[PDB]
């Protein structure tokens, strides 16, 4: 009744998306549903072993936007039989059978359904905002309109392009490239703080941030 | 607060101009100002400028990443910043 | 400097500035840049806008948000 509805509200605001939604819109979307210190984590197994990516609050708007940059024109989450748990200060939601659904546009409109465990922690207050978001992807499917199979039906070169997936584990290149970049850039933010306070060159900022590290 | 896309776009524009100057590409630098019709005033920083300095320590940390350490020459302070 | 990723770092920056100039509509600046730097004109682009713009959007988001 509380956490379940929040995801429905989240799905509902994503239906307002248009191509002109930008930095300010995605930041407003993220402030409505996430804490100022929210953490978001995505997990999957593309090649080699398991990959895990974790980003903080200021990187969370562009994560969601990257899904739309990737071709998605619609995004929603279906949570089948999620487990609630109330604590003194937060509420957990744990859904082993979570589905992330995206609809791509012209041409050859394709639908991507990503399955995984969605684990959430909400703040127990009025704006029941998300403190942690953890999505562990197990597998994904990609669906083709029957009309667009019949379109490229007797065209051997177009019809084997239709057997190639369009995402890798449900992540399109936009999203994957973004999360990987965020590994390097996001702890540079400490360097950037230094730069803003002491007038010091970035490489000296870095030099000085090795200082705290070996010290403790 | 949070920057808009245009604020970010224009800040990148300015710093690429600075980059072009400090890199010995003064011809490109003013061509660029005209092709994008920049009009506001510009004062710039010491070489190599904001973009060059930040890009280069970003690229260092990239190369000093655990998964790229070998097969990518990098500095040691970047390596240890990870650890 | 004497850091050993520097020449590649600066190779890449130049490469991405040129891609940025082309995708931003600065056709002549891009052509001029190449000849001002002694680079043979045979660079193939990514999709618009290139990496420099994408890298910058994340960097500046973090830079603005970075506190004192």
């Amino acid at each position: 009744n509380q956490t379940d509805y929040r995801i429905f509200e989240l799905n509902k605001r994503l239906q307002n998306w248009t191509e002109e939604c930008d930095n300010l819109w995605w930041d407003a979307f993220t402030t409505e549903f996430f804490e100022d210190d929210a953490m978001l984590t995505i997990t999957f197994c593309l090649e080699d072993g398991p990959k895990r990516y974790t980003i903080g609050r200021t990187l969370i708007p562009r994560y969601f936007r990257s899904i739309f940059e990737g071709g998605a024109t619609e995004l929603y989450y279906v949570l089948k039989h999620p487990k609630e748990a109330f604590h003194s200060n937060f509420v957990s939601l744990d859904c082993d059978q979570g589905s992330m659904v995206t609809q791509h546009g012209k041409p050859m409109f394709t639908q991507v359904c990503v399955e995984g465990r969605l684990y959430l922690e909400f703040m127990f207050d009025d704006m029941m905002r998300i403190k942690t978001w953890h999505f562990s992807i197990r597998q994904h499917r990609e669906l083709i309109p029957r009309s667009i199979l019949a379109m490229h039906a007797q065209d051997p070169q177009m019809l084997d392009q239709l057997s190639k997936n369009i995402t890798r584990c449900g992540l399109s290149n936009s999203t994957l490239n973004y999360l990987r970049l965020c590994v390097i850039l996001e702890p540079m933010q400490e360097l950037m703080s230094r730069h803003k306070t002491y007038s010091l060159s970035p490489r000296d900022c870095l030099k000085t941030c090795l200082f705290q590290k070996w010290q403790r | 607060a949070v920057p808009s896309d245009s604020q970010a776009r224009e800040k990148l524009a300015l710093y690429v101009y600075e980059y072009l100057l400090h890199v010995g590409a003064q011809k490109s630098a003013q061509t660029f100002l005209s092709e994008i019709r920049w009009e506001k005033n510009i004062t710039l920083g010491e070489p190599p400028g904001f973009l060059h300095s930040w890009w280069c320590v970003f690229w260092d940390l990239y190369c000093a990443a655990p998964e790229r350490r070998e097969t990518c020459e990098h500095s040691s302070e970047a390596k240890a910043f990870h650890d | 400097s004497a850091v050993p990723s520097d020449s590649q770092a600066r190779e890449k920056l130049a490469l991405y500035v040129y891609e940025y100039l082309l995708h931003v509509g600065a056709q002549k600046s891009a052509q001029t840049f190449l000849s001002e730097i002694r680079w043979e004109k045979n660079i193939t682009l990514g999709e618009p806008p290139g990496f420099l713009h994408s890298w910058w959007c994340v960097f500046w988001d973090l830079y603005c948000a970075a506190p004192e």
């Binding site: - | 890199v23 | 991405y16 660079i43 193939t44």
Partner: peptide
């Protein structure tokens, strides 16, 4: 010609402005 002028690319092979994270 100002100290931080870019390297030559003695690599003549066709350079690609690809994302430095994209897999090959």
């Amino acid at each position: 010609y100002t100290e931080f002028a870019p390297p030559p690319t003695p690599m003549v092979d066709h350079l690609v402005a690809s994302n430095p994270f994209e897999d090959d």
